[PDB]
Design a protein around this ligand. Sequence first.
Ligand SMILES: Nc1nc2c(ncn2[C@@H]2O[C@H](COP(=O)(O)OP(=O)(O)NP(=O)(O)O)[C@@H](O)[C@H]2O)c(=O)[nH]1
Ligand SMILES: [Ca+2]
Ligand SMILES: [Mg+2]
Length: 138
Amino acid sequence: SVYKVLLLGAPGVGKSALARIFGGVHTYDRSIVVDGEEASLMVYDIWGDAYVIVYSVTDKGSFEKASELRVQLRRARDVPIILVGNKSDLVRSREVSVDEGRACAVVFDCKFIETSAALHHNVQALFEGVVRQIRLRR
Ligand SMILES: Nc1nc2c(ncn2[C@@H]2O[C@H](COP(=O)(O)OP(=O)(O)NP(=O)(O)O)[C@@H](O)[C@H]2O)c(=O)[nH]1
Ligand SMILES: [Ca+2]
Ligand SMILES: [Mg+2]
């Protein structure tokens, strides 16, 4: 019983940072307990049992690319998709709002979370969600 997770997204959004925090220990293994049940995770920083599409909240381009990739996945080859807006710490140079990120997620059938790899914020919550989500579909 594997849980392979593919890390997708535009350049420099924080993909490896998120993976390296979670792991582990680019392929990153790690066994977490959600939310009563042990679950193992294999996180793939490619640049699947779930796709994590990362954008930077300070980079509106990576956000639109994120949406573009979401519709691509929806048309190709179902699997959970998590939309992640990383770098929530850079409050001055933010170009995408939370609600804009959360509203995008609903309409296009994503789970949504904002993280900051810099502050280790919601990184654990992200990967616990992925497990929960894989579990909704299975
Ligand atoms: N302030 C802040 N900086 C972050 C955060 N996450 C990543 N960064 C910074 O953003 C840069 C890119 O991070 P990285 O994880 O390498 O992104 P990437 O998506 O792997 N880039 P690439 O696809 O080009 O390899 C790094 O210099 C890193 O320190 C975050 O949450 N907050
Ligand atoms: Ca189930
Ligand atoms: Mg990288």
